[PDB]
Amino acid sequence: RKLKIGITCYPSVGGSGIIATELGKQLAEKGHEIHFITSSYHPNIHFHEVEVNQYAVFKYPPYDLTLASKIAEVAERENLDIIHAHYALPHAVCAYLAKQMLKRNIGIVTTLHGTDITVLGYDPSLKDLIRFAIESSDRVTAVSSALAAETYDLIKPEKKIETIYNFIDKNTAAIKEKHGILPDEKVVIHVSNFRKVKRVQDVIRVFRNIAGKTKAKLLLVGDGPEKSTACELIRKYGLEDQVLMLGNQDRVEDLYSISDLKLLLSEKESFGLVLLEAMACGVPCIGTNIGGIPEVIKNNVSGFLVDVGDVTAATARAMSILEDEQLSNRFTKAAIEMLENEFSSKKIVSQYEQIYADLA
Amino acid sequence: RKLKIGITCYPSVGGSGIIATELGKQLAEKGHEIHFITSSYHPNIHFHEVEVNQYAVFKYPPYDLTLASKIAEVAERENLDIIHAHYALPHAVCAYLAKQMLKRNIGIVTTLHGTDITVLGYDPSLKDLIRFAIESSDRVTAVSSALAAETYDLIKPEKKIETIYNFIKNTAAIKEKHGILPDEKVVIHVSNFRKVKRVQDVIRVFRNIAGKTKAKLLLVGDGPEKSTACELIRKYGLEDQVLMLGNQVEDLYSISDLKLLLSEKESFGLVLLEAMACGVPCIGTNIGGIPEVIKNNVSGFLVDVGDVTAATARAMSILEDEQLSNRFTKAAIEMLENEFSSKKIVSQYEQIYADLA
Ligand SMILES: CC(=O)N[C@H]1[C@@H](O[C@@H](CC(=O)O)C(=O)O)O[C@H](CO)[C@@H](O)[C@@H]1O
Ligand SMILES: CC(=O)N[C@H]1[C@@H](O[C@@H](CC(=O)O)C(=O)O)O[C@H](CO)[C@@H](O)[C@@H]1O
């Protein structure tokens, strides 16, 4: 049965935004009627805008209250069966308030992406609010089992948290030519928001060890607070010519397509959607053995996992992969099979769809 | 029964923040345990602060969620019987969330001061939220019967809204400090200078007065429309006859002969009670709660919104009839000790808390 699903999220802040929007499109293609309720296409996809109108009275812009009001407005006017929030805070709480205002039993689905753990590390006193958010949702999913376990540890809600993974939606010569890459050169890639937990310094010390060993370029893709930290480490090591600070990019597939190695060396990472994208483009990955990364990369099967801060071992693995087309190609092969099965959008979208069917 | 009472509000937005804090003081002086939960001498009174950050996750700082979190935290820890919110938005909604988070029952008291009407004017989409806030509080109060009625007419909450009112020198030296000479009459206006205060109307009225008698004008406070005000002054060349002060106010009330409040929207007008208490006769507009404070021709005058003509005539009667001025003044102070006394009102809020606890 076609359903009418509200989706409330930050429009696009990397991973979760991409996921939420793609999930909406895919559902639309199966005949559901999708209403995005955010800040900010198909006949069945509609957009409703949360606009904050602070002219007086409010000391801070009442975006949470405004969002809740808008969810309830759209829920009533469009007869929504489901509101699917992404993040506990603020979105599940806003969905909750909206349900209370509506005075009917709309189903609330909440997807945890890891940001509630982050927020909690800066302000531990939010624990009970996050627990509330979870416990007030009808069904709760997490993008990895590790995240679900960390939520149970730190939040301890009375709620089943179901694991539903993330998913993803040629002329490499030309692309290398554009970025002035020589057919001669190995290509290492890293795509992130350059926040401290991404440990970009570890990516550069790994790369530096690499490029003192073979003809190599690093593609640094993204923007964020530790970018100036990055440059500095690059200049300190004198790798200015061998690194393409590419800042944030369009057509990220082009960059993964030219690359031979993807590194994600985070200390915190609930999933790592950039791993799937590198996988889909045939790039073997080295990730840290933390969060949900071991659920994506299986060590010495579809990639390598290292310890946080282990630049030495990451360098060893990098070389192993770069020098050996055998290993690289079997890693690559194993990874594509994961993509076609555990991480395919047909499979994940139908897991979310089943949730909605259950509640409707 | 001594009680543990949480108070959440914006701690000094002008009038409502004075009321909420004074109310706290009065309850602590009768020995209840008071806990302020806000942004921000007695020891039955404590303070809890909310800190609000984006942390690179939140698009905006989630004041409302952090505050609701803190209320739940304080309520649990200190076993609060009551959380008394001032304003439906955000504060009653934050109290509601906290209550829902709490295992304990807790009584939610919300007092309306009229800002929720202001919010609704700017954003008509928040009507249902505001109605929800009101309906989800256990007991709701409004600082005038006019506000209670307008709330009902505009928001239509099905909830009882109970009227509980607001409550409350060397003049030579002070006048000297301000270059006010001893034969100058002194008109005063105290506000936040918002459009609904109609400071332009205050200034027209004053021009008329300063044209009929030797007069200064104390314009006290700050706000967007202060600039509007200054231009109107220059447009009439009254620069020299106006003192523009920010906030520091009793001193000024004591050197004044007449207080004007000519708003088009005013749920109560706390400045009125401060003026009255300092022996200053008031002229107010005939809207909102101002007719609940001023008795026309008895404890001041009331006029129609915008009626600069009527306002000038009343002003002149006051300024040149010491008899009238003194009778207004005495009647206003008797009202103060009866209807607007802190002893009375504070006991009214207590009865609410007793019922719920
Ligand atoms: C810190 C963290 O756990 N970030 C996860 C989280 O990343 C956040 C962004 C962030 O890192 O704060 C997001 O994308 O909304 O969600 C992604 C999508 O599910 C994951 O791929 C990221 O691992
Ligand atoms: C516009 C309005 O109704 N303002 C009332 C309202 O004033 C607001 C400030 C304002 O919005 O004017 C406040 O103090 O929070 O509350 C006061 C205390 O109850 C009343 O004295 C004012 O009449």
Swiss-Prot record, chain B:
Disruption phenotype: Mutant does not produce bacillithiol. CDD domains: GT4_BshA-like (cd04962). Pfam families: Glyco_transf_4, Glycos_transf_1. Its EC number is 2.4.1.-. UDP binds at residues 192, 248, 274. It is an enzyme of class 2 (transferase). (S)-malate binds at residues 16, 87, 115. Belongs to the glycosyltransferase group 1 family. Glycosyltransferase 4 subfamily. This is N-acetyl-alpha-D-glucosaminyl L-malate synthase.
